Design a protein around this ligand. Sequence first.
Ligand SMILES: Nc1ncnc2c1ncn2[C@@H]1O[C@H](COP(=O)(O)O)[C@@H](O)[C@H]1O
Ligand SMILES: [Sm+3]
Ligand SMILES: [Sm+3]
Length: 201
Amino acid sequence: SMSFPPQRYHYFLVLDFEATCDKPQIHPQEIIEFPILKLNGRTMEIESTFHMYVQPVVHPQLTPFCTELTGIIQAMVDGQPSLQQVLERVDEWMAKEGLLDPNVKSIFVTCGDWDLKVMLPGQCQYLGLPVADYFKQWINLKKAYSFAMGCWPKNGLLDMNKGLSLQHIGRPHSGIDDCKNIANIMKTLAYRGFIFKQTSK
Ligand SMILES: Nc1ncnc2c1ncn2[C@@H]1O[C@H](COP(=O)(O)O)[C@@H](O)[C@H]1O
Ligand SMILES: [Sm+3]
Ligand SMILES: [Sm+3]
């Protein structure tokens, strides 16, 4: 096939939350890291980065497990805006990037469905906040990978990097680093000729 074919979107918006957690799981979970990488729709190159840590409210003190898992320390979320304000910052960032133009086509890309099917809508429902329409469609990279490679990856980014012989970027369970791996996997899948499609229902 053709390497780096024409794609259906002008930009891809790579997103990977980190959230409060514990062993056994904390309830409710709350977003504590909100990264978005804006990728050129054709080349998959990173052109802009949104990144904010978020101050949790229901369980404001990060557990030892959460800090061990994510590397996020208490001082990184203390003094930060809450999710409501971060969502307003995202909307302003989308506007300045030119992504609110109806003729500019973009879609979010996540590893799995959890981030936009479960985490964001669930916390927004808890807080009584509407979900912006652009969060309601996305590409699940694991499903896209399964069509591009003909196989179901077992453990997310690590196994997709393994299958494509890519070196892992940065630290697992860091939101921004997970985004960098998603973007690197996407670049390789496009190099192999894959055309990305919405997977969310
Ligand atoms: N092994 C785990 N045990 C408990 N919670 C987890 C685990 N892995 C991920 N999580 C939660 O899911 C969020 C997203 O995970 P990830 O995108 O894989 O870093 C984390 O920030 C945690 O809140
Ligand atoms: Sm993740
Ligand atoms: Sm992650």
